Structures are given as C-alpha cells and as structure tokens.
C-alpha cells in the first residue's frame, strides 16, 4: 500500500562538462547528465522506487539528453516544465594541480522556472526532495521554496544542502536561506564539508543536535571514505565506509540520498510519524543502503548509480 | 605611410564547440576560438596587417582562450570591452547524415555590449569590418550599427553578411536589417549561399550590379571550390578556385575577407577614392590572395588561417 507511493524530486537538472582527451590528443568537454536533485531521482529510479522529477528542462538537444536519461531510469518527469530556453552547463577544468569551474546558467530552462509551473501534489506523493543550487538561484529558488513551504505540513520533506562553492561562491544570504529551509525538512543529509560552510559552533555531533530541534527528525552527515553518521532524537548511528577503487565522486552524495529514501520507502517508514520513532536498526539499514549504493557509483565515472538488479549478491 | 594604418574589426568572438571522439571512444565537444569577425581579425593579424578587434569578451576561461588567440596573432584587442558575463557558445552535432546546431548566447559578454563601450576611432584607422550575427543580435547589434553609421563617411567599411541560418533561423527583419547595412559598406563579400538568402531577383552578376549602385564600390561573391567573382563599376573579375584536400571549411570565408583587405592594404588602396578606381589587375590580386589564403585554412581544421611566412613560395 505504501509501496506505490511516489517520491517527487524537485530541483536542478544540468549538464556536467568534464575534461577528456580526444583521439587527436587534445582537451574536449564530455557532456554528462547531472545535477544533484536530478542524480538523486535517477538513483531512486534505478532502485525501483516510484519516482517523480519536477524541474525546468530545455527542448534543445541537451534537454533531450536529460529526458532520455530520466526515461531510461523510469523516472516520471511529466511534472517538469519544458521551455525553449537553453540547458544549464557546469564546466570543470584541470589547471596545474586543481580543478576550476565555470557555471553557465544565464536565462536557462532550469533557472527561469515560474510559480505557474508548480506541480499538483496529491495523496500518492509520500515524500519530496529539494536541493541547494536550485533553492538558491533566482528566480527558480523562490518557486522551490514556495513548494517546500506549502507541502511541508502534508508530506515527508528531504533536504540536501549540497554547497557548491566552486559553482557559486557562497555568501550569507545563501547560508541564511539554506538555514531557514532546514526548519521545513524532516530529513537532512549533508557532507562534513557541507556542514563546515555553515558557520555554526561546536562538534559535528553537536550541530546535528541543534538541527534536530529545528524540525528535522533525522540528520545524516557523510564522511567520504569513512561512511557516515546518522542522528535522531532517539539514537546516533555510525555507519562505516566501504573500501572500493574510485574513478570519481560525481553524484556520490546523491546516491546516498537515494539509498536512505529507498530503504525507508521499502521499510514503510516514509511518514512523519514513523520518522519520529525510527529504531537504531531502521536508521542503520537506511544509511547502510545509502553507503553501499554509493560504493557502486564512485567506481564507474558517475553520476552513474546502481540498479537494484546490481547489488543482488 | 599607409603601411601603418590599422584595420579595426568589429563583431562577435565566440567558441565553436565541435564534436570529437574521446580516447574512451565517446562524443565530446572540443573548444575552438571562433566567430566570423574574430576569425577575420586573426587572419589579418597573421598576414602582417596592423589589426584591431572591438567586441565584448568575457573574463572567464573561454574569454581567456579568445584573448590568448588574439594576442598570439598580434591583434590589438585593447578596444574590446571586458565583462564578467559568459562567452557565446556555438554547438555543432552530427545526427545521422547532417549537422545540427545549438546557439548558446544568453546574456553573454558579446551580446550585452553597450553604446558606452564604443571605441575611439582616430585617423590611424584606415578601415573597419563588420559581420552579420553581431549586427543582428540584440542589444549588441544596435551598437555595431551605430558605429558603422558614424564611421561610414570617414573610413573604408567592409561588410560580411555571412548568413548563419543554422545558428539563428533568419527572418525578414534580419534580411531587412542586413540590406540597410549594405548601403553603408564600401566592400561587400558574401558567398553564393549567402546571397540566395536575400530574396532578390536575377542573376548573381545582376544582383551585384544593383548593390554597386547602393554605395559599395566592390562586391565579391565566393563560390566554394570554384573560387570567386569580384564586381565593380569598372570591371568583373572571375578568380578560379585552388584544388586542395579539405579537412573542414570553418573560417574559410573569413580568411577570404582577410586576404582581400591585406592585399588592398599592401597595395595602398584602402581609401574610398582608390576603391572607386580599382584596375582589373588590382581587383584580381586582392581576390586571388584571398583565395590562396583560404586554401591553407580549409586544409587543417580551421579557423586556422595562414601566417605570411607560410605562403612564402
Ligand atoms: Na538543439
Ligand atoms: Na539569468
Ligand atoms: Na538552475
Ligand atoms: Na562515479
Ligand atoms: Na572561468
Ligand atoms: Na540575452
Ligand atoms: Na554575439
Ligand atoms: Na579548416
């Protein structure tokens, strides 16, 4: 009965433009489907969760790449708003030792979203997910914030404040905005790197405790190779990392999101009441699935999350 | 004395994003410096003509590619207006048999040019050059049109209406605008493909005759492999093509522009009076240089025009 309820992901869908060598031996940019909320919808799709995607998607050929990717991962993107504006591009370049970024998001299909584009949300939507860059950008951010505010009292809200300082150099109004978004979330997952960008005092375990009093019932901090720690009002759950050979980490965190949600969905715990009474074991299963799933992704030039027929054992 | 006068190119500078294969065996886009007026400035630079470039150039890394390319071809781009807006991108993709295009020009450094950015033009500027896409785009087009109108009475104007239907599907106001630009030009060069987009009656040789009455003293129609025909009020000059093995044709026409101008510059004929009295031989030398120079470009994945120390014999 809970099994057919949908998780509706709301946020950015973009193209990661990553440097590769041509056969001629020179630098080119290879287009990958991407975006944190997008990547999470894909991973939820591949895990067999009924998944929706609300966003602004272009009708150009890059938009085509995104819709094709969603469709092949069984994500329902009928919610999405299609226009003739271009697709967001995120450029990564290697200069000497380090990466440099260029964010091409002028007048895009994603950025120029409108209140009128807001989707109808009925009782078959058990949970919704929001991300950082789309919530912070203007004018689309106003739309997603509105949507989050409206449905927060009705449904499970998952928030991933993935700070991308490299894409958009972050300021206070961004940390200010994100902070007042946290209040509206039931589940919050962020990396230890993300949490540091918030200027808050104390231990990581201490910060999590403050946020649990702000409305979230579950806070998850991810620690790269070292796995993650999950915090609620009833427990703290360390989950060890998994050793694997890493090609890259694009979309790794997004897969963690998906595993946590898929497990809770599967366990039939995606209600506000059930999240308030999670046992230690239920928390561990969710975060562990998240970690296992991300193990696969980092292996093969992700964002390329695992199908559920992968991870079979 | 005429030898130190500068040709000032005014128009777009963009990045051609062309499909290549990665070592991994998949499609990527390789960034090339490009833009018709840009390509022409480069070629004039490499031919040893004192050359200027007025345009809108980004401060991002794509903008860096363009400034580096200009600098290494000895083009003076101090006239250019630098801002923090992104660089124009022109995507080409091969789908089945044919090419498909995507033009990414939202809120760019090039497109958002202003009246205030207009350059000071003194008596050391013998000639100026304008192109199509920048003259048609808004709001930058208003700026270039203004500039052309102001300096037309003072200096030699060269106009290249290179129609790019694939980049921007062309409408009447574009043909209307281009047409009323032609009046202000002393030299006009366009391809037979370009001329067809104008809906005008009669033979190509007939059309050229009409335009010569509109103000232009010299009209050149290029015919791909078959070379070109040059028209004035005193003569008609067929110039045969050159047989070469062609890698591509990006920037070919732009090199023709440069050779015509370089030759006239060298011959000391870049004045309104001298263009009104060109002999048959003087016309032939100019257009022939244009054709020879373009022979080199089409050979090596241009826009990559010849240095004058190439073409040495
Ligand atoms: Na397209
Ligand atoms: Na914008
Ligand atoms: Na966006
Ligand atoms: Na990966
Ligand atoms: Na940059
Ligand atoms: Na614009
Ligand atoms: Na432009
Ligand atoms: Na070429």
Q: What is the DSSP string of B140-184?
A: HHHHHHHHHHHHTTTSEEEEE----TTTS---HHHHHHHHHHHTT
Instruction: Tell me A238's DSSP state.
Output: E
CB-CB contact of B37 with B160 (8 Å): yes
**A21 at the B interface (CB within 8 A)?**
yes
Nearest-5° Cα angle at B261, B141 to B159: 25
CB contact under 8 A, A31 and B31: no
| Residue among B17, B21, B106 minimizing CB distance to A22 | B21
Instruction: Tell me A116's DSSP state.
Output: G
Residues in chain B: 313
How many CA atoms does the CB half-sphere of A215 hold within 13 Å?
17
CB-CB contact of B8 with B79 (8 Å): yes
CA A92 to centroid of ligand 5, rounded, Å:
9
Q: Which of B132, B54, B58 is nearest to B88 (CA)?
A: B58
| Residue among A28, A31, A93 minimizing CB distance to B20 | A28
Q: What is the DSSP string of A186-223?
A: SEEEEEHHHHHHS---S-HHHHHHHHHTSS-SEEEEE-
Cα(A67)–Cα(A49) distance, integer angstroms: 18
List residues bridging with B177 in a β-sheet: none
Cα(B276)–Cα(B263) distance, integer angstroms: 16
* Chain A hits for B23, Cβ within 8 Å: 20-23
CA A150 to centroid of ligand 2, rounded, Å:
25
CB-CB contact of B102 with B164 (8 Å): no
Residue position matching structure tokens 């999405």: A80
Task: Give every CB contact of residue B80 below 8 A, 6+ residues apart in sequence.
Answer: B13, B53, B54, B55, B56, B57
Q: Beta strands of chain A (E only): which ranges? A: 6-10, 14-21, 27-34, 51-54, 56-58, 81-83, 89-95, 98-104, 125-131, 156-160, 187-191, 218-222, 228-231, 236-239
* Chain B hits for A20, Cβ within 8 Å: 22-24, 26, 28
Residue position matching structure tokens 């895009």: A108
Q: Which of B178, B247, B252 is nearest to B214 (CA)?
A: B178
**A102 at the B interface (CB within 8 A)?**
yes
CA B256 to centroid of ligand 2, rounded, Å:
38
Distances (CA, A) of A143 to A104, A119, A241: 20, 11, 36
CB-CB contact of B109 with B58 (8 Å): yes
Cα(B230)–Cα(B287) distance, integer angstroms: 7
Query: Which residue intervals of A83-165 are DSSP H helices?
Result: 132-136, 140-151
CB-CB contact of B255 with B222 (8 Å): no
Q: Which of A226, A224, A225, A229 is nearest to A207 (CA)?
A: A229
**Disruptive mutation site among B18, B20, B169, B304 for chain A (greatest number of A CBs within 10 Å):** B20
| Assigned token pair, A46 | 């591949």
Supply the angle between the helices B36-46 and B252-266 in degrees, to the nearest 10: 40
CA B14 to centroid of ligand 8, rounded, Å:
16
CB-CB contact of A34 with A250 (8 Å): yes
Find out whether the peptide bond into B118 is cis, omega within 30 degrees of 0. Answer: no
CB contact under 8 A, B61 and A93: yes
Which domains, from first to last, does chain B contain? 1-313 (3.40.1190.20)
CB contact under 8 A, B106 and A93: no
**Considering every ligand atom, which ligand is closest to the CA of B167?**
1
CB contact under 8 A, B31 and A27: yes
Instruction: Tell me A137's DSSP state.
Output: S
**A60 at the B interface (CB within 8 A)?**
yes
Which residue in A has a C-alpha nearest to residue B16's C-alpha?
A: A28
Which residue in A has a C-alpha nearest to residue B18's C-alpha?
A: A28
CB contact under 8 A, B86 and A102: yes
CB contact under 8 A, B20 and A30: no
Cα(A286)–Cα(A260) distance, integer angstroms: 4
Which residue in B has a C-alpha nearest to residue A87's C-alpha?
A: B104
CB contact under 8 A, B23 and A23: yes
Q: Is A202 left (phi over 0), alpha (psi -120 to 50) or beta?
A: left
Cα(A78)–Cα(A50) distance, integer angstroms: 13
CA A193 to centroid of ligand 2, rounded, Å:
28
Cα(B258)–Cα(A260) distance, integer angstroms: 62
Neighbours of B214 (CB within 10 A): 14
Task: Give every CB contact of residue A184 below 8 A, 6+ residues apart in sequence.
Answer: A148, A149, A152, A157, A159, A215
Instruction: Tell me A226's DSSP state.
Output: G
> Coil, strand, or helix at residue B57?
strand
* Chain B hits for A104, Cβ within 8 Å: 86, 89, 104
How many CA atoms does the CB half-sphere of A289 hold within 13 Å?
23
Torsion of CA A216, A218, A221, A222, to 10 degrees: -130
**A28 at the B interface (CB within 8 A)?**
yes
Listed resolution, Å? 2.1
**How far apart are the CA of A295 and the nearest CA of chain B, in angstroms?**
22
**Disruptive mutation site among A16, A29, A96 for chain B (greatest number of B CBs within 10 Å):** A29
Q: Which of A282, A302, A306, A303 is nearest to A293 (CA)?
A: A306
Helices (H) and strands (E) in chain A, counts: 10, 14
Asked how this structure was determined, the answer is: X-ray
Residue position matching structure tokens 């209140």: A115
CA A145 to centroid of ligand 4, rounded, Å:
30
List residues bridging with B76 in a β-sheet: B52
CB-CB contact of A297 with A304 (8 Å): yes
Cα(B93)–Cα(B110) distance, integer angstroms: 23
Cα(A43)–Cα(B254) distance, integer angstroms: 48
**A206 at the B interface (CB within 8 A)?**
no
* Chain B hits for A102, Cβ within 8 Å: 60-62, 86
CB contact under 8 A, B23 and A24: no
Cα(A57)–Cα(B153) distance, integer angstroms: 48
| Assigned token pair, A181 | 């978004």
Neighbours of A9 (CB within 10 A): 36
Torsion of CA A197, A199, A202, A206, to 10 degrees: -70
Cα(B189)–Cα(B45) distance, integer angstroms: 19
| Residue among A21, A61, A106 minimizing CB distance to B86 | A106
List residues bridging with B159 in a β-sheet: B130, B188
Q: How far is CA A244 from the centre of its chain?
A: 22
């Amino acid at each position: 009965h809970h099994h057919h309820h949908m998780i509706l992901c709301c946020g950015e869908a973009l193209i990661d433009m990553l440097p590769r060598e041509t056969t001629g031996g020179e630098t080119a940019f290879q287009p990958f489907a991407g975006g944190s909320v997008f990547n999470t919808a894909i991973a939820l799709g591949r895990l067999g969760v009924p998944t929706g995607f609300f966003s602004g998607i272009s009708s150009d050929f890059f938009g085509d790449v995104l819709r094709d990717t969603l469709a092949r991962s069984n994500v329902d993107y009928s919610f999405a708003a299609i226009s003739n504006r271009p697709t967001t591009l995120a450029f990564v370049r290697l200069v000497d030792g380090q990466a440099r970024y260029a964010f091409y998001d002028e007048n895009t299909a994603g950025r120029m979203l409108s209140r009128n584009d807001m989707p109808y949300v009925d009782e078959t939507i058990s949970a919704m997910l929001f991300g950082c860059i789309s919530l912070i950008s203007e004018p689309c951010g106003s739309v997603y914030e509105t949507l989050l505010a409206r449905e927060a009292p009705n449904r499970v809200m998952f928030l991933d404040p993935n700070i991308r300082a490299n894409l958009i150099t972050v300021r206070k109004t961004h940390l200010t905005r994100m902070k007042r978004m946290i209040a509206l979330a039931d589940i919050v997952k962020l990396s230890d790197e993300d949490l540091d960008w918030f200027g808050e005092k104390g231990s990581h375990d201490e910060i999590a405790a403050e946020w649990l009093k702000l409305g979230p019932k579950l806070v998850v901090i991810t620690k790269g190779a070292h796995g993650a720690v999950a915090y609620t009002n009833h427990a703290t759950v360390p989950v060890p990392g998994v050793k694997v050979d890493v090609v890259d980490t694009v979309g790794a965190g997004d897969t963690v999101n998906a595993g946590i949600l898929a497990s809770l969905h599967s366990q039939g715990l995606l209600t506000k009441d059930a999240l308030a009474n999670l046992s230690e074991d239920q928390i561990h299963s969710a975060v562990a699935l998240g970690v296992r799933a991300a193990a696969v992704t980092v292996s093969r030039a992700g964002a390329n999350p695992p199908w559920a027929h992968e991870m079979r054992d």
